[PDB]
Structure formats: structure tokens, C-alpha cells
Design a protein around this ligand. Structure first.
Ligand SMILES: CCC/C=C/C=C/C/C=C/CCCCCCCCCC(=O)SCCNC(=O)CCNC(=O)[C@H](O)C(C)(C)COP(=O)(O)OP(=O)(O)OC[C@H]1O[C@@H](n2cnc3c(N)ncnc32)[C@H](O)[C@@H]1OP(=O)(O)O
Ligand SMILES: CCC(=O)SCCNC(=O)CCNC(=O)[C@H](O)C(C)(C)COP(=O)(O)OP(=O)(O)OC[C@H]1O[C@@H](n2cnc3c(N)ncnc32)[C@H](O)[C@@H]1OP(=O)(O)O
Ligand SMILES: *C(=O)CCCC[C@@H]1SC[C@@H]2NC(=O)N[C@@H]21
Lengths: 344, 70, 172, 406, 69, 135, 135
């Protein structure tokens, strides 16, 4: 006896409702106990309303009765401001979000997708540690996922949102990407945690000193620190609005032709530079006046603060701005200023 | 509401003068807005006619980009 | 690696490493980006890549030292190879992080038995060999002539598919 | 630019001698040169004899007129001389012969104006050349998710598949519900009816459909259907038209004559065509996809960009009655030694195999299916994929050409 | 020709016509169980069913003439 | 470099699921990528059934061993069930059938060493790839 | 198709017959044959002389029949005249479809010399993703 077509469709609908919370009630409760949103709720707040199409929702580890749908990551595609993107989000409710085989295969499939279409990819990272029951599989799939940045580096923008403890092997894929945005007091990044640093070296260190968001931003591992995940999503939107989808296409043109004549704001530049040569001033006073408007979108502002790297627009066209900041260390080009500029 | 409207900056027409004006302006409209029916056809594109050195960087930044840009 | 790729020299990786050196000084010194650049370079390189593992290949040491997953072409291991996510002592230490009573005799017995089992069953060549993460386990004396045969096979390697573009970006 | 040839002529002008053969050779050489470069369409509107047949054979599409057009290499009189066979020109080379038997005619028009209308429909899907995009109609896409934008016609797909897996349905009912305005230009409709191929639009964008047809040979693949779909796929891929496969295939048609006429060699052409193709490739599985036919009909590892399955999809190595024989052969032998009701044992084991494995979910678990979807979602998934994959940044290893089975 | 013929070997499960009934192209003529499918065999042309030759439950071979239209 | 496949196998390993079909698809896709890039030679030295038949068909040359190798998609027992035809596996798929009838075998060797000799002779005429100089 | 697309050196030796569309298929000059040579026994024609004379000098054979002549003897004499005039290599050689008519013994030398001349060829074809061979 087979089931009817209607019964099969009803079964599908209920299985899809299961696969939207595959960790089950206890993991939902532990997530609400910590107050974090789900991986899907994160994706749905990033993307344009209703644009998300999930790929591999029903994936499971082969030959494992204890496998859970999705294997600990959500992957799919959607739009930001109507422009295609790929997105993945770690789901710490399934196997603590550790890297399984199907986790690897799904993220690899997505990376190949965005390479094939030529669109940005956003990773929402919170914890992708080694899987306790199959750590050699996690080692292999960290490496397999890493390798596929070969398809993307300098072809499509890659963005990493650091919404949790990015530790161990999990640090090396994000650090390949073009833009890392960490939530303050929530995102962390470090190879070796405080416990093992203590028991190997004897040293004591806190999470914040080791890999806190503002420390990693001053070190230049993180490009942006924000106070909330919503602010991270808005920084990503603003960032992508200066950029083409890929190495080939054109960027969006925003407000061309404004203010075609000399303005009073242009005339303020004639007296903006101090008379005395020793006096410092804020370079943002110049940058806010020489481009199309005040939308000087700064990147890695904490890293080497004697240097400004920002996007701006000229006649509606996006440009990169590299400016010295006399307000900080007289604007001398130090170590971090040099590498910030070179990367930008 | 963030469309740029027609503004009568000076003068105050009657309804009939406004109607005559707007009918004339609409007849003077530019026709169909944009040639949305324009289609990509790269056959015989000028960049394919150029001689490139076998090691020319313009193979990347000119030829390839022109073929691939969409 | 970038220099060698630029001048078309094949790369031979000879592995005996626990991976990245832990500590606050290395983290502040930039170990994440520097490892990222090592990974970037090894995947970027088009030249033939052959690997021989001698003893340890733990974690990122395994990955970066010409693993097959990072596009190495031929991977061999001596029978002393130990391929794992972490060494036996690190696995034992987290084992003992739970129910921590490190002064007791019984937990030292548990550590010793765990390390013994781990070095017999986990940190070996054999799981990687049975999964095909490495291409062969070899007698050490074979290495010289096997390198000759392998690099003769790989001499005309063409690396693809790759999308031509201005350049690859790297952690910088 | 497209080249249209209207063919009607008694072969070489005999009085001129070998010069006519030299000009035939040059014509053929130009057809081969143009192959895959510009669309070539051949109308046959009278008797085409001798050398006149080979140029149409080399073009991309052949349209013949019913009763009034013929193609043949050598006439009935020579055939009678050499073989004794008595045949009319109509039986030898008429439009019905080249549709149903030889697989050479892509369309059989009711008359000359109907033939012209078909040619204009074709050209409306085709680009002018392989460096150009197919002509795209501007279509107002609704705004919202796939679930939010379902129509009543989309909802008709949720009930289309019969409750019995032994009951066929006409695959045209699916094709015309996913295509815009129900408009499907079927190609070669009177040949190898176990597979349906043709052109339509999704949101204005030309697509090639390839779909198994359950009402003919249960939708099995065979020699003729494999060759029909292989060349349709290669034409679409030459001219940048993306393809959608609708899959309901139990396997290959069993028979000694399929093996002797070369099902292995000739069926492999469809594998090759699909694996060569670099346009967007979407698969929709609507019930069965078994074994080697699963591999052929747009599997993920053959490079299908998007694979979706309906809840009724059955993806398996083989049918459960075959599988049980091997996966439980030991148990059946033990029961036979015990003298048990091994027939009821086979029924029970088969039911368990069907309930465990003959479904879409094992392939979805492996990620061979990207999503298992309500049937109404099909048009939305297709439209999304085709919009995103207008340019695919994929490449083959450099070669002069491939070596497809012939 | 006018012969509707069995395209497959199979078991006749149902006959959808009677002798002398008018039929139109694409009308159902018989249901043959073959390859685990209730395969429809249909009239290819308009006419009248003559020489109806098949019975419910009959196994028939490929190329059996089912009826002449 | 040339790829030589020696084929001898009863199809997909049925206890393994559709995973075997995914691997078949990957193998065929590689045969299609390699087509016209490197010489691909298939020796058939036993009964190749089901999915094992398409990879040979995608390679450039097929050498079968007489009376001791077969290729067929569907086995004689399924053929018997569906069509009533009795056929031996040798009539269905033998080296002689795939030479003289279906045009799938490029050589029928009298034995395994004769098949290897034919393969070495074939290779002696071929370059290693589509861009190297001929021997 | 395969012959027309091939861009390697293509050499044709016509030994005896090459009629009709098969002359086109078997390596005709305008199908891109680099060197065509013919033996003295070559016979290059639209069709066999019996068919050709069954067509040209039709009507003439029919008024011979109406006048009651021995039309079978006339048909024989017309066949011989056609064979002697046209069914030979020389009309093709006059139009340059044959590059040389050669003693058969010269064949090995001509082939070797042509292959050495043609060992490097450039042939330029329109750009395509791939061709669309009949299948
Ligand atoms: C022109 C075109 C060219 C372009 C070319 C472009 C090319 C680009 C190519 C780019 C190439 C990219 C390459 C990528 C390489 C791959 C990376 C390599 C893999 C690794 O490098 S791999 C090692 C892993 N290592 C370390 O690494 C450091 C050492 N680090 C450690 O050695 C430790 O790991 C530690 C502590 C320091 C890290 O931190 P931690 O280990 O993550 O955390 P913890 O153990 O303290 O957490 C608490 C624990 O309680 C346990 N637990 C039990 N029950 C429960 C429960 N109910 N709930 C929760 N927890 C539970 C559980 O075990 C959990 O641990 P967990 O769940 O296992 O994390
Ligand atoms: C390599 C290609 C070849 O070897 S083709 C060699 C000759 N083949 C032929 O088709 C010869 C004649 N064949 C025929 O049966 C008919 O022409 C076909 C094609 C069937 C058409 O029949 P139907 O429409 O009745 O025409 P028809 O036979 O009455 O001829 C009408 C006029 O056309 C002429 N014609 C015909 N074929 C040729 C030819 N190949 N070369 C030169 N002239 C040809 C006939 O002589 C006749 O001319 P006329 O106005 O009656 O004096
Ligand atoms: C049912 O009784 C078993 C035989 C039919 C099996 C079907 S037939 C069509 C498919 N092709 C094949 O080889 N097996 C499948």
C-alpha cells in the first residue's frame, strides 16, 4: 500500500516544519535561555523580506540515526536591496553547530553557487567548532571549505559576521573574507582559548583580552565592531551599496549630478587648514566636503587610526578614499596604517 | 512621496490653462521611457578585432572584461 | 611558496608538526592572518604539490602542510604518521577538564589509558588512509624514487578550472 | 544572422556533371562551418532528392510539409532495381516517414503557411547567433516569496500526480502549467513520444523543456528518445537557451533490439549532451528517477544547477521488487529452507524497502536534491534559478572539440 | 494503416471501446499492464472501432492488432 | 596523461543507496570533461552491467575480450519478464554482439594478453594529450 | 560533418569510383581536402553512366522507340559514349577538384610528401561554443 499524493504532500509540509527547528524543544529552550535568535531568524533579518530560498534543509549525516536535519548550518540565497546574495548561518542548536560532513558539503555547494552566478556571499558565524564524535571529519571539512575560497578571492565580495566565539579551525575561513563585522561582547576570535593557554604556557588571560571584538579590531583582524546584530546587517547593506556584485559588473550609481556649481561648503575648504604648521585637525572636515555628500563610509576605523580608508561617491560613482588623519599621531604612517591601506 | 514633481514656480494658471499646458507637455513627452527591448549581441564587437600581444594585460582588463561584463 | 609558484618549481612538503604555536604572544603577533596567508599561498600555487608526512600532522599543521583537501596533488605518509585534529595529550586534557580532579590517582590512570587508546586508534596513518585523505602509506626507503615517479607524472600539471582575473586577494 | 533554406529540387543537375558535386561540397562545408554559430532552419516543401537531403540534415531544424514534401537519397526506381522492394516516394521519404521512423523532421506542417508559422515561432525563441542572448520579453514579476505568489494554476500541480504509482499522466499538463501563457512549441512531437522536448518561456525568458512522458513506454528512455533529447539539448546549449528537465523515468526500455541497435552507445549521447551543456540546467523530479536513468536525467553530479523533487518523487537504485531479491536474498533462502510462505515474505520485505528508501528524502539527505517542494512551487524555483544563471561562470578544459559517441 | 496495435507486450486490464463505436484521435482504446504501468493505448485517427480482438485479462504480444479504426 | 579503465562489475552496489548513482554521475561527468583532452581506453574483461556500461561508451576506445566479457544495461531475466525473450548473457552482450551488431567494441581480443597488446599498440599511435606533440 | 570539421591534414587518394553524394562525403576538395590525387582508373561522376544516359538522351531514346529503332542498342552506344567522355578523372582534374592524376605506384610517395608539407596547418573557423553535429 502506498500513501496518496495528498498524504505525501502533508508529510512533506510537516517534515519541513520540523526541519525549521531541527534541534528540538530542549535546544530551542537553551537558545532562548541565552537570548540569541535562531540561525534562520538571523538570515531573515539580514535578507530582503521573503527573498530567502533555503538549500539542503533536509540534509543529514549519512548512516547516523542520531543525525539532525541541516547538520548545523543554514544555507541559501536571497537578495539584499534587490541584489542577489548567497548566505549561510551557523546553527549552534544542532551538534553545537560543529562542522560535520554535510555541513561542509552544504557550505561548499553555496560557495560554488556564488562563484558560478558571481554574487556576494555572507557568512553568519557564531560557533563552528570541531565535532566531538567525528573530529577527523571536521578537520577534513574545514580544509575542504577553506579550499573553495580559491573560487571567490577577488571575484566576489565575501563578508563574515562574527556573532559568537570563532575559535580553533573556525578562524581561518573568516580571515580570508573581505569584511569582518563583530558584535561587541558577543563575537570573539582566537585560535587557542584561555584554558589551554593557561595549561600549556601557564599564562592567565580573559576572553576579551585574548580575542574580544575591540582588541581584534585594533589588531586589524576585524574591520567593524557594532553593538547589535541589526547594526551588523545595516553595515553590510551600506557596504554592499558601494560595490559591484563581482569582479566584472558595475556598481550602483547613486544620486549623480548633485550640486553641479561651487557651493558654500566648497568655499569652507579655503579656510579649513590651520595657519600654524604644528596644529592638528580632523581630516573628516575635508572628506565630508570634497565628495558628493556626507556618505563617507569608513572601514576598519580602529585598526590604524592615523589612516582613513573609506568608500565615498563622486558624481554618483563609488571610490575608495585613503586619507591621512593628522588628528592621530600627526598622521604618521605606522605599521597598521600601512597594512590597512595595502589591503584596502 | 518622493517623486520630483512639476512645479509652477511663478504664475497662477486657471484650470483651463493648466489643462492646456499639461496636455502640451505630455504630447511633448519623450515617447517610450527607455529602450528596454535592447538585447545583448556581442558578434563582431570591436574589442575582438584588436591585435593583442600574447602576454598583453589588456586581455584581462579589456577583452575579458568586455565579454564578461553584464 | 609564492616565489616557487612564480618560477614554476614543484613543491615538496615534509610534515612533522603539531600545528600553530599557541599563546597570547603569537595571537598578538598576528598568527591568524599569517596562517591565513600560508593557506592562501598553498591553495593559490599552480605548481605540482607532493606531500610526505613524517610523524605528526595535527590540526592546522595537517591542513596547511600540503593536505589533499588544500589541493595537494599526491599525498604519502610514513607508517609513523599521526594525523589528527589534536594530539593525544590535548584530547586527554579536555577529557580531564570534565570531572576535573587532577590530583587523584584514578584520573591519571584514565589519562594514561585514554592516551594509549588514542595513539593506537585515532592518531595514526590508518583512518586517513582508509578514507583516502592520503594516497598511500609507504616504507620510508621508498621516498626518493617515489618522489621521482610522482613528479615525473605531474610535470605537465595544468591547474583548473580557474577564473582569470586581476589577482587573488590575501589576508593583508 | 539566421539562415533559412527552402529546399525543393531533383538533386544535381546531371548535364552539368561534377561541378554540381563541387558546389554541393561547398554548401555542406558552409553548413558545417555555421553549425552552432548561427541558427539554420530548413523548410522542405517539395521532393528533395540526392545531394539536396544532406544540407537539411546538417541544419539545426527541419520542417517538412505533409504529403507535398519528400526527402530521399535514392529513388524508388533504383530501390526496385537493386532490392526488389516496391515503394512510393511518399512511403520512402514523406514527412510522416521522416517524423515517426527516421527522426529527421522536427515538424510536420499541415501546409505551407503552417510551416512558415512554425518557423517564425522557432525564430522567436532563438538568438541571431551564439554570441547573443535569446530575445527576452519584459514580464511584470509579482513581488513576494514563492509561497506568497502562488496562482490557482500553480495549485493545480499539487493534485496532478495520480495516487497510484502505476497510473500515467500526460506530462504536457505539467509543461503548460509551468510555462508562460501555456504556450509550448513542441519539437519533433511525432517521434519517440516517450520523451517530450520543446521551447517555452518562463517570465519572458526562452527555455528548452526535456521531459519524460509516462503515457508512452511508461516514460522509459530508449535509443530514439535519447537521440531526440541529446540533440535538442545540444542545440539549446549552442544558442544559450537554458534547459529544464521534468523527470519521471523508470529506467531504460528492456529488450534485445535495444542492445543490438546500440542503446549503450546511443543512449550515452544524452549523458554527453547534458554533461557538456553550460547553460543553466534545472531538474524537477516528478515521481520516478531510477538507476542509470537517474544519472542521465539531470542528476546533481552531472552538473544540474538546481534539483528539486516533488513529494511523490521516487529516487532509488532500482525498483523495490528487484532490490529485495539482492538485499534480502539470504533471508529469502533461509525462509525457503524453512519452507515458509516466501511469497508473503517478499511482499513484506518489499513494502519495508518501499517505505524506507523509495522516496525523495535519501537523495535530499545526501544533498542530491536541493529542495523537496510542494508541486505548486515549481514555477517559482525555475524562474528564480533561470534569472540568476543568465551568465554561468563555468568552463571545460581546453579542447578542439569533444568526442561524443556517434 | 487503420490497425491499432499493442505497442508493448502486456496484460489487458480494461477495454475502453465497443465494436462499432465511433472514436476520435486520442480517445482511449485499451489499458495494457506493461512495465508496471497501466499504459493507455489510444486511437490514432477518427473512425469506427472494427474487429475488436482483445478481452479483459488477456495477455497479448507486441504487434497484436487491437482494433481497426 | 592517458586514462586506462579496466571494467568488470555488476553495476551499482545495491545495498549502498543512491550514493552509488551520485558517484556514477561524477565519473561520467569526468569522462565528458576528459573527452577529446586525454586518450581514454576501456578494456572490458568481464560482465559489465548497468551503470558500468556508460563510462566505456564515453571513452575513446573499447576493447572487449572474446567470449569472456559482456556489456548490457538490463539483464536477461528482466528482459525475459518484460518481453518474453529468452537470451543468454553472451548473446545479449557478448564481444561479438558489440562488434558486429551495435558497433560499440573497437576490438575483440582472443584473450587478456592480446587485449593488452592491442591497448599498447593503440597508445603507441596517440599523443598523451590534445596539445602534446605526437610520438 | 566529421570530415568537414576536421582540421588535421586530410589527403584523398581516389582509386576507381567516386559517384554522386558519396564523392562529396569521401574527402572532396571543397569539403576541405588538402590534397586530392586520383589514379588513372578513377571514375568521378554525378551518377553511373546507365542512369545518366537514362536521363540525358531521354526523349531521344523515346523517339527512337517511336521510330522503332533498336533502342537497346542505342542505349548501349550512348552509355559507351558517356563512359568514354565523362566517367574518368579528367573532368574533375580540369576543374581542379583533383590536384593530380598519378600512376598508382606514386601513391606512397605522394602521400608522404603531402603529409610532410601539411604537417603544420592554420585553418580559421567562426567562433562557437561547440558544433551541433547530427545525432
Ligand atoms: C587568482 C586567483 C587566486 C586566488 C586564491 C585564493 C586561495 C584562498 C585559500 C584559503 C584557504 C583556507 C584554509 C583553511 C584551513 C582549515 C583550518 C584547519 C583546521 C584546524 O585548524 S582544526 C584544530 C582545532 N584547534 C585549533 O586550531 C587551536 C587549538 N584550540 C584547542 O585546542 C581547543 O579547541 C580550544 C579550547 C583552545 C578552542 O576552543 P573550543 O575547543 O572551541 O571550546 P571548548 O572545548 O572550551 O567548549 C566547551 C566544550 O564542552 C564540551 N561539551 C560537552 N557537552 C556539552 C554540551 N551539552 N553543550 C556544550 N558543550 C558541551 C564540548 O567539547 C565543547 O567544546 P566544542 O563543542 O568541541 O567546541
Ligand atoms: C547527386 C544527385 C543526383 O545524382 S540526382 C540524379 C538525378 N535525380 C533525379 O531526381 C532525376 C529525376 N528524378 C525524379 O524522379 C523527379 O525529378 C522527381 C525529383 C521525383 C520530381 O518528379 P516530377 O515532379 O514529376 O518532375 P519530372 O521528373 O517530370 O522532371 C521535371 C523536369 O525537371 C528535369 N529534371 C529533373 N531532375 C533533373 C536533374 N537531376 N537534372 C536535370 N534535369 C532534371 C526533367 O528533365 C524535367 O525537365 P523538363 O522541363 O520536363 O524538360
Ligand atoms: C516488473 O515486473 C519488473 C520488470 C520491469 C522493471 C522496469 S521496466 C522499465 C525499467 N527499465 C528496467 O530495466 N527496469 C524497469
Amino acid at each position: 500500500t502506498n500513501k496518496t499524493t495528498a498524504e505525501l504532500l502533508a508529510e512533506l509540509r510537516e517534515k519541513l516544519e520540523l526541519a525549521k527547528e531541527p534541534g528540538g524543544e530542549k535546544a530551542v529552550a537553551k537558545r532562548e535561555k541565552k537570548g540569541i535568535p535562531s540561525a534562520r531568524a538571523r538570515i531573515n533579518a539580514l535578507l530582503d523580506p521573503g527573498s530567502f530560498i533555503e538549500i539542503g534543509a533536509l540534509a543529514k549525516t549519512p548512516g547516523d540515526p542520531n543525525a539532525l536535519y541541516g547538520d548545523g548550518v543554514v544555507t541559501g540565497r536571497g537578495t539584499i536591496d534587490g541584489r542577489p546574495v548567497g548566505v549561510f548561518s551557523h546553527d549552534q542548536t544542532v551538534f553545537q553547530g560543529s562542522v560535520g560532513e554535510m555541513f561542509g558539503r552544504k557550505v561548499a555547494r553555496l560557495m560554488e553557487w556564488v562563484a558560478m552566478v558571481g554574487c556576494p556571499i555572507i557568512g553568519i558565524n557564531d560557533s563552528a567548532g570541531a565535532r566531538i564524535q567525528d573530529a577527523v571529519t571536521s578537520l577534513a571539512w574545514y580544509a575542504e571549505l577553506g579550499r573553495r575560497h580559491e573560487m571567490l578571492r577577488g571575484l566576489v565580495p565575501e563578508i563574515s559576521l562574527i556573532f559568537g566565539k570563532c575559535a580553533g579551525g573556525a578562524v581561518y575561513s573568516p580571515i580570508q573574507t573581505d569584511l569582518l563585522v563583530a558584535v561587541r561582547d558577543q563575537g570573539y576570535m582566537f585560535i587557542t582559548g584561555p584554558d589551554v593557554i593557561k595549561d600549556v604556557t601557564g599564562e592567565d588571560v580573559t576572553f576579551d583580552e585574548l580575542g574580544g571584538a575591540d582588541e581584534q579590531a585594533k589588531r586589524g583582524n576585524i574591520h567593524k565592531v557594532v553593538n547589535s546584530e541589526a547594526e551588523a546587517y545595516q553595515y553590510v547593506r551600506d557596504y554592499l551599496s558601494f560595490l559591484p556584485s563581482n569582479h566584472f559588473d558595475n556598481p550602483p550609481i547613486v544620486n549623480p549630478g548633485m550640486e553641479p556649481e561651487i557651493t558654500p561648503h566648497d568655499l569652507e575648504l579655503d579656510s579649513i587648514v590651520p595657519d600654524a604648521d604644528n596644529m592638528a585637525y580632523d581630516m573628516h572636515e575635508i572628506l565630508l566636503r570634497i565628495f558628493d555628500d556626507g556618505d563617507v563610509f569608513e572601514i576598519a576605523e580602529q585598526r590604524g587610526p592615523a589612516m582613513i580608508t573609506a568608500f565615498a561617491r563622486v558624481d554618483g560613482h563609488p571610490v575608495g578614499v585613503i586619507a591621512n588623519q593628522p588628528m592621530v599621531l600627526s598622521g604618521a604612517i605606522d605599521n597598521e596604517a600601512s597594512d590597512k591601506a595595502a589591503s584596502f | 512621496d518622493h517623486e520630483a514633481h512639476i512645479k509652477v514656480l511663478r504664475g497662477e494658471p486657471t484650470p483651463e490653462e493648466m489643462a492646456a499646458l499639461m496636455a502640451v507637455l505630455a504630447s511633448a513627452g519623450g515617447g517610450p521611457a527607455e529602450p528596454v527591448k535592447k538585447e545583448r549581441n556581442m558578434w563582431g564587437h570591436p574589442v575582438d578585432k584588436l591585435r593583442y600581444s600574447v602576454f598583453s594585460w589588456q586581455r584581462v582588463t579589456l577583452l575579458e572584461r568586455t565579454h564578461m561584463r553584464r | 611558496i609564492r616565489f616557487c609558484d612564480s618560477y614554476n618549481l614543484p613543491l615538496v612538503f615534509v610534515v612533522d608538526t603539531p600545528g600553530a604555536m599557541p599563546g597570547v604572544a603569537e595571537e598578538k603577533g598576528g598568527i591568524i592572518k599569517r596562517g591565513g596567508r600560508f593557506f592562501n599561498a598553498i591553495v593559490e600555487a599552480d605548481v605540482p604539490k607532493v606531500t610526505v608526512i613524517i610523524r605528526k600532522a595535527y590540526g592546522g599543521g595537517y591542513a596547511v602542510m600540503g593536505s589533499k583537501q588544500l589541493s595537494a596533488d599526491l599525498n604519502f605518509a610514513w607508517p609513523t604518521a599521526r594525523i589528527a585534529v589534536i594530539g593525544a595529550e590535548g584530547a586527554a586534557q579536555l577529557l580531564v577538564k570534565r570531572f576535573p580532579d587532577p590530583n587523584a590517582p584514578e584520573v591519571q590512570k584514565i589519562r594514561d589509558d585514554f592516551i594509549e587508546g588514542y595513539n593506537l586508534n585515532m592518531a595514526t596513518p590508518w583512518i586517513a588512509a582508509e578514507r583516502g585523505y592520503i594516497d598511500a602509506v609507504i616504507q620510508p626507503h621508498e621516498t626518493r624514487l617515489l618522489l621521482r615517479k610522482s613528479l615525473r607524472l605531474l610535470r605537465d600539471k595544468q591547474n583548473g578550472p580557474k577564473v582569470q582575473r586581476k589577482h587573488g586577494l590575501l589576508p593583508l | 544572422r539566421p539562415l533559412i533554406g527552402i529546399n525543393d529540387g531533383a538533386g544535381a543537375r546531371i548535364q552539368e556533371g561534377v561541378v554540381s558535386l563541387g558546389l554541393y561540397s561547398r554548401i555542406f562545408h558552409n553548413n558545417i562551418k555555421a553549425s552552432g554559430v548561427i541558427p539554420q532552419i530548413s523548410l522542405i516543401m517539395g521532393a528533395a532528392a540526392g545531394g539536396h537531403v544532406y544540407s537539411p540534415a546538417l541544419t539545426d531544424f527541419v520542417v517538412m510539409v505533409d504529403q507535398t514534401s519528400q526527402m530521399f537519397i535514392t529513388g524508388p526506381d533504383v530501390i526496385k532495381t537493386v532490392t526488389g522492394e516496391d515503394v512510393t516516394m511518399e512511403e520512402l521519404g514523406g514527412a510522416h516517414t521522416h517524423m515517426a521512423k527516421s527522426g529527421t523532421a522536427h515538424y510536420v506542417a499541415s501546409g505551407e503557411q503552417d510551416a512558415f508559422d512554425y518557423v517564425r515561432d522557432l525564430l522567436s525563441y532563438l538568438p541571431p547567433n551564439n554570441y547573443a542572448d535569446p530575445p527576452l520579453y519584459p514580464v511584470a514579476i509579482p513581488e513576494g516569496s514563492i509561497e506568497e505568489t502562488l496562482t490557482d494554476e500553480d495549485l493545480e500541480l499539487d493534485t496532478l500526480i495520480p495516487d497510484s504509482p502505476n497510473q500515467p499522466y500526460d506530462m504536457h499538463e505539467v509543461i503548460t502549467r509551468i510555462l508562460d501563457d501555456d504556450e509550448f512549441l513542441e519539437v519533433q512531437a511525432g517521434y519517440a513520444g516517450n520523451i517530450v522536448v520543446g521551447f517555452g518561456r518562463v517570465e519572458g525568458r526562452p527555455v528548452g523543456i526535456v521531459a519524460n512522458q509516462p503515457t508512452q513506454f511508461a516514460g522509459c528512455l530508449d535509443i530514439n528518445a535519447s537521440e531526440k533529447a541529446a540533440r535538442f539539448i545540444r542545440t539549446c546549449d549552442c544558442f544559450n537557451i537554458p534547459i529544464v528537465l521534468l523527470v519521471d523515468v523508470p529506467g531504460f526500455l528492456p529488450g534485445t533490439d535495444q542492445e543490438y541497435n546500440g542503446i549503450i552507445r546511443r543512449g550515452a549521447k544524452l549523458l554527453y549532451a547534458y554533461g557538456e551543456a553550460t547553460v543553466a540546467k534545472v531538474t524537477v523530479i516528478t515521481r520516478k528517477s531510477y538507476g542509470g536513468a537517474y544519472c542521465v536525467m539531470g542528476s546533481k553530479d552531472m552538473g544540474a544547477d538546481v534539483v528539486v523533487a516533488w513529494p511523490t518523487a521516487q529516487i532509488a537504485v532500482m525498483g523495490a521488487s528487484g532490490a529485495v531479491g539482492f538485499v534480502y536474498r539470504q533471508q529469502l533462502k533461509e525462509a525457503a529452507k524453512n519452507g515458509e510462505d516466501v511469497d508473503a515474505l517478499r511482499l513484506e520485505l518489499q513494502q519495508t524497502y518501499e517505505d524506507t528508501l523509495v522516496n525523495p528524502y535519501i537523495a535530499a539527505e545526501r544533498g542530491y536534491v536541493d529542495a523537496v517542494i510542494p508541486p505548486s512551487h515549481t514555477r517559482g524555483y525555475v524562474a528564480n534559478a533561470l534569472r540568476l544563471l543568465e551568465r554561468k561562470i563555468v568552463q571545460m578544459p581546453p579542447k578542439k572539440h569533444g568526442n561524443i559517441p556517434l | 494503416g487503420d490497425a491499432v496495435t499493442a505497442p508493448m507486450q502486456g496484460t489487458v486490464v480494461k477495454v475502453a471501446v465497443e465494436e462499432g463505436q465511433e472514436v476520435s484521435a486520442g480517445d482511449l482504446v485499451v489499458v495494457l499492464e506493461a512495465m508496471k504501468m497501466e499504459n493507455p493505448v489510444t486511437a490514432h485517427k477518427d473512425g469506427t472501432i472494427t474487429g475488436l480482438a482483445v478481452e479483459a485479462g488477456a495477455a497479448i504480444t507486441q504487434g497484436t492488432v487491437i482494433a481497426e479504426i
